RNA sequence: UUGACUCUAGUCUGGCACGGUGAAGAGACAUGAGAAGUGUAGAAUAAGUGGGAGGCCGCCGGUGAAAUACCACUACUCUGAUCGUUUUUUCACUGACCCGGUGAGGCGGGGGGGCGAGCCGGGCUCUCGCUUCUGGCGCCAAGCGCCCGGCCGGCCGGGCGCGACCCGCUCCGGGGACAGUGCCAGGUGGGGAGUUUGACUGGGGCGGUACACCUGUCAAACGGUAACGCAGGUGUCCUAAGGCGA
RNA sequence: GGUGUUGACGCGAUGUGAUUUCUGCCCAGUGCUCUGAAUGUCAAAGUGAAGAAAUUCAAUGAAGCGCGGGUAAACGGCGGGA
RNA sequence: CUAACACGUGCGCGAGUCGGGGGCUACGAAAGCCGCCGUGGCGCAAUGAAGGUGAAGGCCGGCGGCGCGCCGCCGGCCGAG
RNA sequence: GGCGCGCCGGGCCCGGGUCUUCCCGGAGUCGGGUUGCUUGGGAAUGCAGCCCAAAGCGGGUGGUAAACUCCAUCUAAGGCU
RNA sequence: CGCGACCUCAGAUCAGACGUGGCGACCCGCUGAAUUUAAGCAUAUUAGUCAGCGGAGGAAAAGAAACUAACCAGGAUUCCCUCAGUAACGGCGAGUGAACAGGGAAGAGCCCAGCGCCGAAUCCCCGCCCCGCGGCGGGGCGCGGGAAAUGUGGCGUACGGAAG
RNA sequence: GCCCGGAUAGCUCAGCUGUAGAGCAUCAGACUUUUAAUCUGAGGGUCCAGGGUUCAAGUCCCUGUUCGGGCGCCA
């Protein structure tokens, strides 16, 4: 793909701030259409994007953790929910799915994904709602920031994708760098390269 | 042959498009190159027809 | 010579190119527009993914559900119609191409003139354009009009236009994107070419196979031993008719 | 290019051989010819699919063969036993 | 008669051999010479289709290993039916 | 005749290294398909007819057809000696 | 209607030139068989040979890589030794059959179009004068004629090159 | 072999998110002289086996048998 056309698209959205003069918090997205990839056949792709800007930024987090996380999570204002809290969380499958409605993505400690599949592994894998693992580096400082914006390209049976990258107030070369990394990662993730797409559309939210 | 190939890329039957160029030009490497060049030309026409 | 073998000029047919221009008919599509997306629960006719918290003056929560709800531009499928890409069928066009005629001699429009139709001197529609009693002659301009030249109104001698209408892009016609040629492909092809047409054998030929094998003899008590010698046999059959044991 | 400085009362290809009297029967065979619409058969190219491609596979379907008429002054043929 | 091959025979050299092609110095277009002109041919190595591989062994000492008296490997010795 | 010397006239008023900025290529040809001939050239070595008929980090070659991918090596379709 | 530029196209016993034909041993282009061999014969073999046709020179053709290789890489063509009667082709039968690498003979490299930049800076022909003239050339003079912008000459060619 | 098509109760056939339907058959009841026929009703499938998408699929797609249909072989 040419890049001066992406410069044209980002100038037309930064001066299509004229086109809406948006009234909420502002963000854009890119859309992908693909040519003859049969969705019911094999080679189904589901890959995560390693991205270096966090284009969401209003990103909603609660974690699931063991101890060593208490004082640091409450110092950085992040909900540490230990196993007795998880018992109260496990006694009903109705409210635990509505806090995933509150909270955008999760992340959990190393051994608590042995206690989440009791009944509630299959209980709330009914959202596409993976809780991501931590490490023995034991730092959620900047690791929450770099595990958010690891964006899931997912193949489901409709033949269209739409991934939220870009809020219109970041800097422009770094945002086209984000779109650059995302689209070449998708072209690599597909069964075949850049010929496999129809048209990439980066129009705004409203 | 280029106009009929651009029209097959417009309808997007790319396999028969490639077989068409390779039967009417020759080597499959040349066919891949001419299909990719006509897709680029057709993309420029789509951008110009957009704005 | 042919019903031999292998081919061949020729001929028949198909495809590709030369090879265009329209118009209808049948379509495949694309593009633009316009409506459908009722298993069940949920106030609900939720097709699907993703973004999203006050647009405009429904919502975010909460409810049921697996999955939600202003917005936007997306990607799916289906249904009537308009447009531009291709295929195909038919009807036409002339411009490549072919044929005929001639000393390529009046072609196509338009103007002017006359004979017939009818409406109120008028125009339209159409036709015509000068030769038919005779084995004659038929060109190389008459007449008209306008200019000009030599000599003294007169002489003598020139030029131009009508007469013989004007304007045009193929000379006229006749075919025509097929005839045809170039190259493939299949058919046909003693018209023509090249070649072959076993062997044994009481001459060859016809017969027979004594040409590959088998039994008994011939075969003269080891083995070997001939002829178109004798009498016969074979080009198979067997899931047991093979192998064990009783 | 010949026929052709020609045009069916001609050109070209055949058989039989003046005249008189006749010219019987057979289209099964081999030819030749006529029509293209059932199952058929059928090349190259063109089309559709699968596959990474070479390639493979399928449908389409020309003539000719088949199939169905005609023809013996076409090659030819025209019984036996009680 | 030329070429190719085989065998026998004479000659030189002998695990080598050969300068035939090239070069250097009347008969002589002969003859000689090269050697860092042996490039090369043939020979000294066979087998396999090919990847390839590519032509004696033993005895002594130390460390059933167990129901490699064999020995896996190291140091010495004999050493080529 | 050539190699030598000299005079007059004429022609040319020429180079190299470093840095910077530019620029660069041969088409009914290459290539593919098919047919025919030819070659040792074998899933086609060369040549030609017909049809299709290009590209520019391209194109050709890389002795088994083909796809993906590194490399290697040249620069055809112009010419003299 | 005429006059004039150009473009196409004629005509000349126009001015000046040029090709024709011969020989053909060696060379180049095309065409191109069959006896023969295979114990027959049809593919092959004879054979890209004999015949045929065109065209040259003192030599012709070839030739300065769209190469050979796959290595520690060589480096135009031609010719010789060798590769080799090998790889390879072939009713895999008869028969056919190269090349690279190595050693030698010889040794030489270059030039356009394009990309460009220079006031077409270029070329041909007529006349006059001087010189030489049996290879019609050198210099000057021409308000002498043409060619050429539909592109001549200078630099410049893949080994890069040009300008400052 | 090969795209191709199928499997649904003892037997044939319809059917994108569940009471698997329609008929023929078997079982029982009533009429009957009697299940000889009539009529009433039932029961009766692990949707060929498994995997996948899906909110769950007998249906949509893969995998594997199994059979149906011509081409491939052969003469
Ligand atoms: Mg025959
Ligand atoms: Mg014949
Ligand atoms: Mg004959
Ligand atoms: Mg005989
Ligand atoms: Mg005896
Ligand atoms: Mg027995
Ligand atoms: Mg007769
Ligand atoms: Mg008959
Ligand atoms: Mg000897
Ligand atoms: Mg030839
Ligand atoms: Mg040959
Ligand atoms: Mg390779
Ligand atoms: Mg050159
Ligand atoms: Mg050259
Ligand atoms: Mg003259
Ligand atoms: Mg001559
Ligand atoms: Mg012979
Ligand atoms: Mg003989
Ligand atoms: Mg003979
Ligand atoms: Mg030959
Ligand atoms: Mg030969
Ligand atoms: Mg000759
Ligand atoms: Mg001479
Ligand atoms: Mg020469
Ligand atoms: Mg060169
Ligand atoms: Mg060489
Ligand atoms: Mg040898
Ligand atoms: Mg043989
Ligand atoms: Mg060499
Ligand atoms: Mg030397
Ligand atoms: Mg120049």
Q: Give B-chain residues touching A35 at CB under 8 angstroms.
A: 12, 14
Q: How was this structure determined?
A: cryo-EM
Q: Are A66 and A112 in contact (CB under 8 A)?
A: yes
Q: Are A65 and A115 in contact (CB under 8 A)?
A: no
Q: Give residues after which chain A gaps, C-N over 2.5 angstroms.
A: none
Q: What is the three-class DSSP state of A111?
A: coil
Crossing angle of helices B14-24/B28-50, nearest 10°?
130
Looking at residue A12, the DSSP 8-state letter turns out to be: H
Final resolution, Å: 3.6
Beta carbon of B32 within 7 Å of strand D?
A: no
Three-class DSSP labels, A92-122: CCCCHHHHHHHCCEEEECCCCCCCCCCCHHH
Q: Are A13 and A202 in contact (CB under 8 A)?
A: yes
Rounded to an integer, what distance in angstroms lies between the CA atom of residue A200 and that of residue A193? 14
Task: Tell me the nearest-neighbour CA distance from B47 into chain A, angstroms.
Answer: 9
Rounded to an integer, what distance in angstroms lies between the CA atom of residue A184 and that of residue A198? 15
Q: What is the three-class DSSP state of A161?
A: strand
Rounded to an integer, what distance in angstroms lies between the CA atom of residue B42 and that of residue A69? 56
Contact A36 B12 (CB under 8 A): yes
């Amino acid at each position: 793909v040419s890049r001066d056309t992406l410069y044209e698209a980002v100038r037309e959205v930064l001066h299509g701030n004229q086109r809406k003069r948006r009234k909420f918090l502002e963000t854009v997205e890119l859309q992908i259409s693909l040519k003859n990839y049969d969705p019911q056949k094999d080679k189904r792709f589901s890959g995560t994007v390693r991205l270096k800007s966090t284009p969401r930024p209003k990103f909603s987090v609660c974690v699931l953790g063991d101890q060593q996380h208490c004082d640091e999570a409450k110092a950085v204002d992040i909900p540490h929910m230990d196993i007795e809290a998880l018992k109260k969380l496990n006694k009903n499958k109705k409210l635990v799915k509505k806090l995933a409605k509150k909270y955008d993505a999760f992340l959990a400690s190393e051994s608590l994904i042995k206690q989440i599949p009791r009944i509630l592994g299959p209980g709330l894998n009914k959202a596409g709602k993976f809780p991501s693992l931590l490490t023995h580096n034991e730092n959620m400082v900047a690791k929450v920031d770099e595990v958010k914006s690891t964006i899931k390209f997912q193949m489901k049976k409709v033949l269209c994708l739409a991934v939220a990258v870009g809020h219109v107030k970041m800097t422009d070369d770094e945002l086209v760098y984000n779109i650059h990394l995302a689209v070449n990662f998708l072209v690599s993730l597909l069964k075949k390269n850049w010929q496999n797409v129809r048209a990439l559309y980066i129009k705004s939210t409203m | 042959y280029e106009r009929r190939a651009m029209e097959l890329l417009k309808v997007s039957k790319d396999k028969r498009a490639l077989k068409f160029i390779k039967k009417r030009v020759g080597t499959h490497i040349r066919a891949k190159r001419k299909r990719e060049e006509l897709s680029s030309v057709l993309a420029a026409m789509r951008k110009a027809a957009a704005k």
